[PDB]
Amino acid sequence: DDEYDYLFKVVLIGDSGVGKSNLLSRFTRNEFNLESKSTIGVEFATRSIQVDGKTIKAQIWDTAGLERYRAITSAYYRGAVGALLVYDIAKHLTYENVERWLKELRDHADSNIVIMLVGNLRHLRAVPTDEARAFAEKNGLSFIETSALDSTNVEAAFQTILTEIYRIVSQKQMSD
């Protein structure tokens, strides 16, 4: 089943209190049989789509949020072409630490990767959508917020960031 056209690396970063694994678990086919965050420190999960006639297989490296003994961040961010900065729309500490995670990206990732900011019933609006949208606008990033019951915009988010990455690599290939 290894029939695809491109292989893109996408990292999942952000505050730990957002619970990224449950929005991931719906679309991602985890490749391992046990939790890889407490053991290895990163949880891999692969997703394939089709863009412009070609097949895009992107592998998502998950968390490393327990960065108390993760000197593996150099290899964790290297080679990545996509980055998802996930915060919770019910917490403001996550939205404030978005700057910190962006510092981690600029320090450990490439300067041309595609970054998208994602915002994740009982709690009511802690982060205004317009403020986060303008924040992503001023920082040159994508932006889409989504909950866990109506997971349409997270699928559209995956297709969006992957489509932008394919645009970058195809424009690089068209300058041979």
Partner: protein, 224 residues
Amino acid sequence: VDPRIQGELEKLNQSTDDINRRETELEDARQKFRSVLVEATVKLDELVKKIGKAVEDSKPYWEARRVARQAQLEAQKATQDFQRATEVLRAAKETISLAEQRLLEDDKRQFDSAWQEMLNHATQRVMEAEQTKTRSELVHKETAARYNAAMGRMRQLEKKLKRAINKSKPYFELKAKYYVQLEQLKKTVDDLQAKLTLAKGEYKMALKNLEMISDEIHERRRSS
């Protein structure tokens, strides 16, 4: 703390770039194959249009030439087999007993198998070497006859279709060239495919030993 994670991780995000690179090279090879095949078909077609019907009805001749070349190669291989069979024979006769040699050669009228019980036991290997040699000579002369048949056939067909063949030479020459180029480019495509598959194999392997590390932590934590 943590054991072998970092090295396999680095290997993984390297095999990503290796996979992408091999894939791009493979796709360029496929494109070159496609464009060469298109160019070949249109060029050959226009050469048929400007050459006429000579190419079509001159086709049995070139086929007879193909079967003639095959009969030639098979004939050569059979001659080789005959030669090595002969050397096996004489090297077996090096067990001398020269009287026994010309006892075998002079007449195989009534060999009477009971003589072998009375003389050198190494005559059996000599005799079976003679058998294999005689059969190799049979296939030698047979394939020689096939070669002569194919040769004379293609020549009488040649003299029957002389004008068409000479008028149709450039089409079959150009088609030969395009076929050689096509098989070379297809070889390139196959080799790049093999490199790509190998890279994906390395990726899958690094992933597998990574989840192996995780599973080794499972039983270590299970001890409690």
